[PDB]
Protein backbone atom coordinates (compact mmCIF):
# COMPACT_ATOMS: atom_id res chain seq x y z
CA UNK A 1 0.00 0.00 0.00
CA UNK A 2 1.18 3.56 0.44
CA UNK A 3 1.58 2.49 4.03
CA UNK A 4 4.63 0.14 4.13
CA UNK A 5 5.96 2.01 1.11
CA UNK A 6 6.68 4.86 3.52
CA UNK A 7 8.58 2.42 5.72
CA UNK A 8 10.66 1.08 2.82
CA UNK A 9 11.40 4.73 2.11
CA UNK A 10 13.53 6.77 4.55
CA UNK A 11 15.62 3.70 5.43
CA UNK A 12 18.70 3.71 3.13
CA UNK A 13 19.41 0.27 4.67
CA UNK A 14 17.00 -1.91 2.70
CA UNK A 15 17.26 -5.29 1.04
CA UNK A 16 17.17 -6.03 -2.68
CA UNK A 17 13.65 -7.49 -2.67
CA UNK A 18 12.55 -4.55 -0.52
CA UNK A 19 13.88 -1.97 -2.97
CA UNK A 20 12.50 -4.13 -5.79
CA UNK A 21 8.98 -3.82 -4.36
CA UNK A 22 9.74 -0.11 -3.88
CA UNK A 23 10.63 0.35 -7.57
CA UNK A 24 7.53 -1.68 -8.45
CA UNK A 25 5.36 0.74 -6.45
CA UNK A 26 7.00 3.78 -8.05
CA UNK A 27 6.56 2.49 -11.58
CA UNK A 28 2.93 1.55 -11.00
CA UNK A 29 2.59 5.18 -9.83
CA UNK A 30 4.21 6.18 -13.12
CA UNK A 31 1.80 3.99 -15.10
CA UNK A 32 -1.00 5.76 -13.20
CA UNK A 33 0.31 9.26 -13.96
CA UNK A 34 0.52 8.28 -17.64
CA UNK A 35 -2.89 6.58 -17.65
CA UNK A 36 -4.41 9.79 -16.30
CA UNK A 37 -2.53 12.40 -18.34
CA UNK A 38 -2.80 10.61 -21.69
CA UNK A 39 -6.58 10.42 -21.70
CA UNK A 40 -7.25 13.48 -19.54
CA UNK A 41 -9.07 13.00 -16.24
CA UNK A 42 -9.77 16.20 -14.32
CA UNK A 43 -10.37 14.50 -10.92
CA UNK A 44 -14.11 15.02 -10.77
CA UNK A 45 -14.06 12.40 -13.49
CA UNK A 46 -11.45 10.23 -11.74
CA UNK A 47 -12.31 10.22 -8.03
CA UNK A 48 -15.85 9.21 -9.00
CA UNK A 49 -14.50 6.03 -10.54
CA UNK B 1 -25.24 1.32 -74.93
CA UNK B 2 -23.79 -0.63 -77.89
CA UNK B 3 -20.47 -0.64 -76.03
CA UNK B 4 -21.99 -1.52 -72.65
CA UNK B 5 -21.89 1.94 -71.10
CA UNK B 6 -24.91 3.11 -69.10
CA UNK B 7 -27.32 5.82 -70.17
CA UNK B 8 -28.62 6.76 -66.70
CA UNK B 9 -25.71 8.10 -64.66
CA UNK B 10 -24.77 6.76 -61.24
CA UNK B 11 -25.42 8.28 -57.83
CA UNK B 12 -22.78 10.37 -56.05
CA UNK B 13 -24.08 10.81 -52.51
CA UNK B 14 -22.99 13.49 -50.06
CA UNK B 15 -20.10 12.44 -47.77
CA UNK B 16 -19.97 12.98 -44.02
CA UNK B 17 -19.53 16.54 -42.80
CA UNK B 18 -16.50 17.60 -40.73
CA UNK B 19 -17.63 17.67 -37.12
CA UNK B 20 -16.91 20.33 -34.52
CA UNK B 21 -14.59 19.12 -31.77
CA UNK B 22 -15.83 19.52 -28.21
CA UNK B 23 -14.12 19.62 -24.83
CA UNK B 24 -15.15 20.64 -21.34
CA UNK B 25 -13.55 22.17 -18.27
CA UNK B 26 -15.19 20.07 -15.58
CA UNK B 27 -14.83 21.40 -12.05
CA UNK B 28 -14.48 20.04 -8.53
CA UNK B 29 -14.84 21.37 -4.99
CA UNK B 30 -12.68 21.11 -1.90
CA UNK B 31 -14.32 22.71 1.11
CA UNK B 32 -13.01 25.36 3.42
CA UNK B 33 -10.63 24.51 6.22
CA UNK B 34 -12.02 23.89 9.68
CA UNK B 35 -10.88 26.63 12.03
CA UNK B 36 -8.33 25.35 14.59
CA UNK B 37 -8.33 25.42 18.37
CA UNK B 38 -7.33 28.80 19.78
CA UNK B 39 -4.49 28.97 22.31
CA UNK B 40 -4.12 31.80 24.82
CA UNK B 41 -0.68 33.45 24.61
CA UNK B 42 1.43 35.06 27.31
CA UNK B 43 2.00 38.38 25.57
CA UNK B 44 -0.44 41.27 25.34
CA UNK B 45 -2.35 42.18 22.18
CA UNK B 46 0.18 44.49 20.37
CA UNK B 47 3.06 42.00 20.70
CA UNK B 48 1.21 38.91 19.49
Any idea what DSSP says for residue A2? -
Q: Which of A47, A39, A16, A25 is nearest to B30 (CA)?
A: A47
Resolution (A): 2.8
Q: Which CA distances in Å does B8 have to A20, A25, B15?
A: 74, 69, 22
Euclidean distance between CA atoms A17 and A10, whole angstroms: 16
DSSP string, B1-48: --SS--SSPPP----PPPPPP----------PPPP------SS-TTT-
Interface of B with A (CB under 8 A): 25-28
From which experimental method does this structure derive? Answer: cryo-EM
The answer to whether residues A44 and B28 touch, using CB atoms and an 8 Å cutoff, is yes
Euclidean distance between CA atoms A22 and A29, whole angstroms: 11
Any idea what DSSP says for residue A1? -
Q: Which of B21, B27, B28, B29 to mutate to test the interface with A (most CBs of A within 10 A)?
A: B28
Amino acid sequence: TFDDFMIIAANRDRSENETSNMVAFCQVLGQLSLIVRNIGLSENELTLL
Amino acid sequence: TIDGQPLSLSLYATPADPSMLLSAAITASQGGGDLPHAVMPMYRFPVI
